Each structure stands twice: as structure tokens, then as C-alpha cells.
């Protein structure tokens, strides 16, 4: 399939209350597999998916040291950013980082990512060529010039083409039962009278992985887009996801309405009715 690995770092300063809090999480596709939190009692990278658990102590120890060093580096970055933007030393600010690789079915790198936001706005990003930067403003151009002079892109590129892809492929193999085989939604339509003349039909998709899915109501085979309430896809808490779509219909006309579900785990798109 096409697969991705990504790390998401968040550092948040709190001047007067000590060093910034640093949290990292790692994902393969829609599956979180590791976390680190600098405010934990004795901070360490921890597993959050069963298939990563087989990695030996050297793995966890090296990653733990990496995160502790990254929290220090982000603290310095946050101080620099405060200066670049001439901001007060009293306020809290946020530095977020996200990086990783996408690979195809053959395992080859399709795209590498390495980018940063300050206070929830794009700051600097490594371009698709993995060789040049896009800076958001004159502050980010300071970072850009520093990184260009120090040949940063080439070292980022080395990680994204080498270790990122090699470790992603490993995780896919070790976790193949959970990562390579989509889990289709369990589906049902429920019916809720509003009054003697209107009722709600709600089409449910539960327990599916990965999160990508499409739910649509049709009336006599035509899409009812303008009239459908659709909720954001949401996590069930067990690594699977949920979504529903609802339409309000005249009482007695329910039989005209069908719910269509598309998901990678289905043998074919489903057509559901109130039944």
C-alpha cells in the first residue's frame, strides 16, 4: 500500500515555571506506536502499539537520549525565536515539528517531510527536493541561512532516505497483521422519529482502520450532499475509528434512502438501508 512514518514534536514554553514541556509521538500510518513526555516521572520513550514491543533495550535507550537532547534543542530554538520576533520574555509560545517519509508498495521513498511551526503558523519547511528550504518570513530566513551554511538539508535528507524508510519497512513487516490489512467498518442504519412527519436516518461506520472513509446518503440513487449531517471521523480509543452520516426524511419515505460506504477494508462498496 502506500505507507507513512511520522514523528510529531510539541514544545511549549512556560517562563517562570521551568523548562518548556516537550512531547513527542510517532505514527506508522494511522497507528501511534511511541511516545515521550519530558514532564513524566522518569522520561523515556514508551511503546504504544504491540508490534514495537519486540525492539530491544538499545532501541529504547537510544531514542530516550535523542528525545532528551531534542527537548534541550527546542528550548534553545524557542529562546532564539522569541528574539527573532522581539517578543516579551514572559509569554508562553509553541514550537511544533513534524517529519517523516512516505513509501510505496515496493518500499521506495515517495516523499520526505521535515517542517516546523511557531505559535501554530508555518515557520520553515524542507522542500520536496530534500535540498532546499521554504521560509515563512524574515525570522525564518535567519534559520534558513544558518541551516544552509551548516549543510543541514543533506543531513536531514540522509535520515529521510535511509533510516526513515528502513525503519518504516521494518515496522510494516513486524506489524503486518495490524498495519498491512485494513479492518472494514461494522455498519448499521438507525431511525429516530423527530415528529409524526419527519425522522432521522443515521448511517454508522464503526471499528474501521485506517481512518480514511466515505459515507454518503443517496435518495433514489442520487447524492444528498447538501442535506447530510456528517461528523468528523473520530477515534474509538482501541486504534480503530468511527463516523456517521445522517439525513432527515419525510416519514414513510425512508425506503428511498440508501447509505453508501467506501473503505479499503471492504471487499466492495456497501449499500445499506434502514433494516
Amino acid at each position: 500500500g502506500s505507507h507513512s512514518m511520522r514523528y510529531f514534536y510539541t514544545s511549549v514554553s512556560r517562563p517562570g515555571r521551568g523548562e518548556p514541556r516537550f512531547i513527542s509521538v510517532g505514527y506508522v500510518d494511522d497507528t501511534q506506536f511511541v511516545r515521550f513526555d519530558s514532564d513524566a516521572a522518569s522520561p523515556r520513550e514508551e511503546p504504544r502499539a504491540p508490534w514495537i514491543e519486540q525492539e530491544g533495550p538499545e532501541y529504547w535507550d537510544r531514542n530516550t537520549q535523542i528525545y532528551k537532547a531534542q527537548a534541550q534543542t527546542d528550548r534553545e530554538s524557542l529562546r532564539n525565536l522569541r528574539g527573532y520576533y522581539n517578543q516579551s520574555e514572559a509569554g508562553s509560545h509553541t514550537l511544533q515539528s513534524m517529519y517523516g517519509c512516505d513509501v510505496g508498495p515496493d518500499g521506495r521513498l515517495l516523499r520526505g517531510h521535515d517542517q516546523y511551526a511557531y505559535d501554530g503558523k508555518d515557520y520553515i519547511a524542507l522542500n520536496e527536493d530534500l535540498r532546499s528550504w521554504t521560509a515563512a518570513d524574515t525570522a525564518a530566513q535567519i534559520t534558513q541561512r544558518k541551516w544552509e551554511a551548516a549543510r543541514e538539508a543533506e543531513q536531514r535528507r540522509a535520515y529521510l532516505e535511509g533510516e526513515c524508510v528502513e525503519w518504516l519497512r521494518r515496522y510494516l513487516e513486524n506489524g503486518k497483521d495490524k498495519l498491512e490489512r485494513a479492518d472494514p467498518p461494522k455498519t448499521h442504519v438507525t431511525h429516530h422519529p423527530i415528529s409524526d412527519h419527519e425522522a432521522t436516518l443515521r448511517c454508522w461506520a464503526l471499528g474501521f482502520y485506517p481512518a480514511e472513509i466515505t459515507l454518503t446518503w443517496q435518495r433514489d440513487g442520487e447524492d444528498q450532499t447538501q442535506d447530510t449531517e456528517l461528523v468528523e471521523t473520530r477515534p474509538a480509543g482501541d486504534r480503530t475509528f468511527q463516523k456517521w452520516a445522517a439525513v432527515v426524511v419525510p416519514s414513510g419515505e425512508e425506503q428511498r434512502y440508501t447509505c453508501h460506504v467506501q473503505h479499503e477494508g471492504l471487499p466492495k462498496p456497501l449499500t445499506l438501508r434502514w433494516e
Partner: peptide, 11 residues
């Protein structure tokens, strides 16, 4: 597995 420093230096 995450990326290490050096490379990935301060902003």
C-alpha cells in the same frame, strides 16, 4: 525510529 542530532540543529 527518530532522527538524532547532529544534523537537525537549533532554529
Amino acid at each position: 525510529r527518530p532522527h538524532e542530532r547532529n544534523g537537525f540543529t537549533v532554529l
